[PDB]
Every structure is written in C-alpha cells, then in structure tokens.
Design a protein around this ligand. Structure first.
Ligand SMILES: Nc1nc2c(ncn2[C@@H]2O[C@H](COP(=O)(O)OP(=O)(O)O)[C@@H](O)[C@H]2O)c(=O)[nH]1
Ligand SMILES: Nc1nc2c(ncn2[C@@H]2O[C@H](COP(=O)(O)OP(=O)(O)O)[C@@H](O)[C@H]2O)c(=O)[nH]1
Ligand SMILES: [Cl-]
Ligand SMILES: [Mg+2]
Length: 414
C-alpha cells in the first residue's frame, strides 16, 4: 500500500476555453473538477477546480509506462508494487476571458503549471497568450505545454502546430519548456505527461520555519440536512499554505478580517479562532504544510464562512505581524499591449483617478490611483489587503470595453 499524505505540490492547468484543461485533470486523477451548478450546465469551469492523485513508478518497467497513479504495475506487466513518489494536486483554472481574475487568484497558489493547447484550434488563441503571459508575470516558470486533442488532427497538422508553439516560446523565458502531445479524452500518452510532471515540475523547496501564511480561496458552511441535533459545526476555510505550517488546536487569525461597523465607518476586524480540524481531499491530518488545497476547520459561526465569504483573505498564527493596508504603493511595469483581446491594442499609461483592479495573493480588489510616477503608483483600495511579505507580486488590470484586462504588474512595497 501507499502512504496517506497531503499533496506536496500544486500544478496549475491553464489555457484557452474548451482546450481540454478539465478533461486533462480527469485523465490524470479520475476526477471531474466542476462541482458548481452553473459549471455543469455550461460545460465550462468557472470557479477554481481541484483534484489530487498519488504518483508512483514501477521500477521493473520501462518509462514512461512505468509511471502510475495507483498502487499497481499491472499496466506495464509487473506484479511488483510501484515505488511511491509523491502526492500531487491540480488547480484547474477557468480559461474564459472574463474570468481572468479567478485564474490569477489560482496562479498565486501554483508551484508549476500545464498550459493546455488544443491541436485543432488556431494558435495562439487569446487566453493561450494571456495565461502564458500571466504565468511569466507571476513567476510560475516550471511549465509544461501540453498539445491536447491530437486524436482529431493528422500527424502533419500536429507537427505544424508543434513548430508554431516552439517558435512562440523562442526568445522567451519558456524557450526550453517541453511540449507533450496527448489526448485527454482518450487517455493517450498520459504516462509521458506524468513523467514530464516529475521531471519538470519538481516539488519546490519549502520554508517551514517562516511565519505560517495560508491564502484563502474558499470558505464553507459544511452543515448539512439529516444529521444529528447537536451544535453547528464550525466554519471551514479553504486555501493553500504558501509558507510555514499549521497544526490542529493552533490559535490563528484571518486577515484583514470581518467587515464590520466601527465609529460610524466601515472597518475590518481580524477574526481570531482556533484550528479544529485539517483536511486534504477526503483525509484528515494533524498538521498542514505547503502543497495541496487544505480545508481548515474552525470554531467560527458558519455564517462568517458561508459562500466563500472569506475569499482573498489570509490566515496566519494569532500573534503574527502582517500588514493590512487600505492604501498601497506599487513599483510597477506595464505590458506593451492587451494580450487577452482578440485584437491586441496598445496599453495606455496609468493616470491618476483611474479605477484599477489589483490581484494580490488570492485577493482581488478595486482601487483608485491617487498618485502616478514613472515606476510607482499609489492606490486607495475599496477594501484593505493583507500583505504578508516585503515584495509580493501584484497584477494590475484595467477595464477596457467592458472587460477587465491585465495591463501590468509590480511589487507591493511595505
Ligand atoms: N477530441 C477530443 N476532445 C477533447 C479532448 N479533451 C477535451 N475534449 C473535449 O473538449 C471539450 C472541452 O473540454 P474541457 O475539459 O471542459 O476543456 P476546458 O474548458 O479547457 O476545461 C469537451 O467536449 C471535451 O470532451 C481530446 O483530447 N480530444
Ligand atoms: N477541516 C475540515 N474540513 C471539512 C470538514 N467537513 C468538510 N470539510 C471540507 O470542506 C470542503 C467542503 O465541504 P463539503 O461541502 O462537505 O464538501 P464535499 O462533501 O466534499 O462535497 C471539502 O473539501 C471537505 O474536505 C471538517 O469537519 N473539517
Ligand atoms: Cl475554460
Ligand atoms: Mg475546465
């Protein structure tokens, strides 16, 4: 048997709408990540999807068939148990152009990524480009490009697009990233992709002694009908631990906290609570480390956590010092053009009084520009943000023709 452990790495799955991201995750994990009503109705990912799998290798078999996702080597002709390598997880992003803020929020949780490119669609589609650019900006450079749907193109067509893709990455940070052809739908060459994941998306070094920080992407009321008449189960908060570690019974706080009234004005009150339970997937643990999306059980009134109320928050230890800022200063750079549009228009300089959208960690916030300089802006936010380190990446978006468009990035200065 394989050990039961948390995932140790998060692999993003990104790319243009319907190119096959969710089907790819299903091919690897057996899981269909879409679980919301609207997602099932539209056949499209809307919220961040999530799935885990164990990875092992059959030492008696040849690669890539030696790589397996369950404790059996029967697939490559061996009765031996495969050697366990690690448990991995996938962050399945929405690829729709209007959902970029959600993709960006998930990118903050990625240790590496797969860019899925459909072989039977013109290359490069708008969100093939946009997600590629966003990965580079956020620094998710451990990338595999997957050429999907090769089952419905000729070999000649596949090779032609392959050349296209290599030329696209030529002269970029991604010049040497591998391109792996698969059919997610028919599970062809998935073993090569597993081998690729092991080679190119290694588990990164972690800093377990740094102040614990979890970025929140979900929060739940897990109380359900038909269960016993005791007091309500506490609110559950979901996200990814980006540094340090958390343990059951630890005093924690949620930042910025709860929107409340104080002295006639809107304020944010840090939410203090204690960790009651820790879960990854269907399994409980006594502590939680970077890697995987974790469910932190708390003693909070479920009304405080219901329906992703705490999305964009962070969790730290109760006594930790973390800046919570209503006004931020960003050392920024602008992209040359708007890559996510079907026609790439030039990016205009940032002007004072503009309302911009800021992606910081898992949070997405609107604010007004109060000051513009050559490499520096100041922004008055509609809601404060937790800034847990001195040089955190932010992505800057502007509303252009009714859509939020990524136009730049920078560092939040504290
Ligand atoms: N022919 C073929 N169709 C695929 C493949 N992968 C996905 N699809 C189809 O493409 C459509 C969109 O797939 P989905 O996984 O939801 O793409 P996503 O929007 O990028 O997550 C669905 O009808 C899939 O069945 C493939 O490898 N070959
Ligand atoms: N830490 C903790 N997590 C929980 C508990 N109950 C549910 N969860 C997690 O909260 C998330 C949402 O809960 P639920 O609506 O029941 O999800 P589902 O049962 O997997 O469809 C899931 O990822 C669960 O793993 C709990 O008692 N403690
Ligand atoms: Cl999509
Ligand atoms: Mg999808």
């Amino acid at each position: 048997a394989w050990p039961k452990v948390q995932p140790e790495v998060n692999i993003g799955v990104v790319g243009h709408v319907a190119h096959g991201k969710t089907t790819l995750v299903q091919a690897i994990t057996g899981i269909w990540t879409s679980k919301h009503s609207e997602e099932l109705k539209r056949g499209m990912t809307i919220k961040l999807g999530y799935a885990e799998t164990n990875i092992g290798v059959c030492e008696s078999c040849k690669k890539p068939e030696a790589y397996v996702t369950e404790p059996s080597c029967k697939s490559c002709g061996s009765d031996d148990e495969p050697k366990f390598l690690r448990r991995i997880s996938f962050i399945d992003a929405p690829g729709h152009e209007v959902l970029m803020a959600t993709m960006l929020s998930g990118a903050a949780l990625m240790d590496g990524a797969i860019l899925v490119v459909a072989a039977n669609e013109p290359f490069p589609q708008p969100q093939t480009r946009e997600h590629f650019v966003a990965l580079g900006i956020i620094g998710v450079k451990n990338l595999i490009i997957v050429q999907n749907k090769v089952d419905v193109v000729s070999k000649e067509e596949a090779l032609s697009q392959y050349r296209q893709i290599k030329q696209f990455t030529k002269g970029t940070w991604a010049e040497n990233v591998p391109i792996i052809p698969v059919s997610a739908l028919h599970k062809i060459n998935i073993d090569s992709l597993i081998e690729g994941i092991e080679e190119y998306i290694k588990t990164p070094y972690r800093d377990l002694s740094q102040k614990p920080v979890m970025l929140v992407i979900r929060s739940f009321d897990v109380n359900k009908p038909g269960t016993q008449f005791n007091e309500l189960k506490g609110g559950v908060i979901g996200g990814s631990i980006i540094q340090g570690l958390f343990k059951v019974d630890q005093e924690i706080k949620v930042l910025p906290g709860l929107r409340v009234e104080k002295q006639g004005k809107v304020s944010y009150e840090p939410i203090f609570t204690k960790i009651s339970s820790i879960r990854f997937g269907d399994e409980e643990f006594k502590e939680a480390k970077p890697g995987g999306l974790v469910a932190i059980g708390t003693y909070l009134d479920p009304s405080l956590t219901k329906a992703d109320n705490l999305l964009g928050s962070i969790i730290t230890l109760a006594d930790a010092e973390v800046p919570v800022l209503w006004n931020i200063r960003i050392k920024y750079n602008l992209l040359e053009r708007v890559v996510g549009a079907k026609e790439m228009l030039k990016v205009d300089p940032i002007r004072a009084k503009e309302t911009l959208m800021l992606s910081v960690g898992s949070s997405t916030t609107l604010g007004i520009v109060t000051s513009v300089k050559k490499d520096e802006i100041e922004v008055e936010l509609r809601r404060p943000v937790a800034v847990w380190s001195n040089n955190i990446r932010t992505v800057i978006s502007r509303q252009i023709a009714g859509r939020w468009r990524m136009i730049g990035w920078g560092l939040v200065e504290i």
